[PDB]
Design a protein around this ligand. Structure first.
Ligand SMILES: [Zn+2]
Length: 266
C-alpha cells in the first residue's frame, strides 16, 4: 500500500542555526555559537576550552569563530558538555577529528555521547548525532584546570542522567566573575512519574534544582540562552536581563511542578 515512513531529520528554529560573531562574556570567556545555541570558548595562555558545540552542522562555524579569536585547531585542548543531546553535543565527533580537543564528561554523558544520542531515555532514536568517545571521565565535584581557569563539575541529573553544570571564575574589570554554565532543567514531553527507564527522575530533578540554586553564580549562562534570559543578538545588552541561578532554578521548579500536575491530569 503504504511504505514505512522516511527518516525524519531533527529540525530546529532557524535562530538556533543562525551564526553569530564571538560575543565576549568575560575576560577569557566568549559565546561562539549561534543566536540560540550556546557554545562557550574559554581562552587561556595554556590553550582553549569549548563548553558545548550546539548542533552537528555547527562544527565549521565554531572553528571559524575560534580562528577569529586566535584559537587554532591545535590550541583547542578540551571539550566539556552540558548534556549529550544533538543540539549541544552535535558537532563533538567532527570537532575531535578536526582539532586537538579531547572530551571530558561524566559516565552518563560519555555513554550517551558514545551512542550518538540513540536509545535516549525519552526520545528513543528521534534525536541522534555522530557518536564520539570521551577521553576522560569526571566525577561529581571534580575539577579540570586549563591555563588557570578551574572548571568544576556539578552533576544536575534530570534533563539527561548526565546533565552537568560547569562553574569557573573569570574576571571582568580586574574583579572575579563566578560563571555558572547550568544545564537545562526542562523535561520536554518526558514521562515524569513512574518512568521505568528513569525511576528516580523526580527526585533527581528536585536535587538538581537545589544544586543549581546553590551554584557560585555571578553570571548564569544556559545551553539555550532564552532559558536564562540571555539575548545573544542584543550586543552590549546580551546578558543584561539574565536570571540568577536562584531564579533560573525557581522558574524551572515551578514549571516542573506544573508539568507534574498536567501529567497527573493527562
Ligand atoms: Zn536536551
Amino acid at each position: 500500500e503504504v511504505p514505512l515512513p522516511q527518516l525524519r531529520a531533527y529540525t530546529v528554529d532557524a535562530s538556533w542555526l543562525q551564526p553569530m560573531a564571538p560575543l565576549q562574556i568575560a575576560d577569557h570567556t566568549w559565546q561562539i555559537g549561534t543566536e540560540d545555541l550556546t557554545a562557550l570558548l574559554v581562552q587561556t595562555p595554556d590553550g582553549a576550552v569549548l563548553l558545548d558545540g550546539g548542533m552537528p552542522q555547527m562544527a565549521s562555524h565554531l572553528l571559524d569563530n575560534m580562528k577569529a579569536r586566535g584559537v587554532t585547531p591545535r590550541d583547542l585542548r578540551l571539550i566539556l558538555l552540558s548534556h549529550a543531546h544533538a543540539d549541544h553535543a552535535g558537532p563533538v565527533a567532527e570537532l575531535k577529528r578536526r582539532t586537538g580537543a579531547k572530551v571530558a564528561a561524566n559516565a552518563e554523558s560519555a555513554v550517551l555521547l558514545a551512542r550518538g544520542g540513540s536509545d535516549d531515555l525519552h526520545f528513543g532514536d528521534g534525536i541522534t548525532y555522530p557518536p564520539a568517545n570521551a577521553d576522560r571521565i569526571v566525577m561529581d565535584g571534580e575539577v579540570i584546570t586549563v591555563g588557570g581557569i578551574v572548571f568544576t563539575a556539578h552533576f544536575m541529573a534530570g534533563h539527561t542522567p548526565g546533565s552537568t553544570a560547569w562553574t569557573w571564575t573569570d574576571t571582568r574589570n580586574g574583579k572575579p566573575v563566578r560563571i555558572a554554565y547550568a544545564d537545562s532543567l526542562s523535561a520536554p514531553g518526558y514521562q515524569l512519574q513512574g518512568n521505568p527507564r528513569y525511576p528516580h527522575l523526580i527526585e533527581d530533578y528536585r536535587r538538581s534544582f537545589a544544586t543549581v540554586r546553590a551554584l557560585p553564580c555571578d553570571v548564569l549562562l544556559t545551553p539555550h540562552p532564552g532559558a536564562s534570559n540571555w539575548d545573544y543578538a542584543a550586543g552590549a545588552r546580551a546578558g543584561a536581563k539574565a536570571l540568577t541561578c536562584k531564579a533560573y532554578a525557581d522558574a524551572a521548579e515551578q514549571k516542573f511542578d506544573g508539568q507534574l500536575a498536567k501529567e497527573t491530569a493527562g
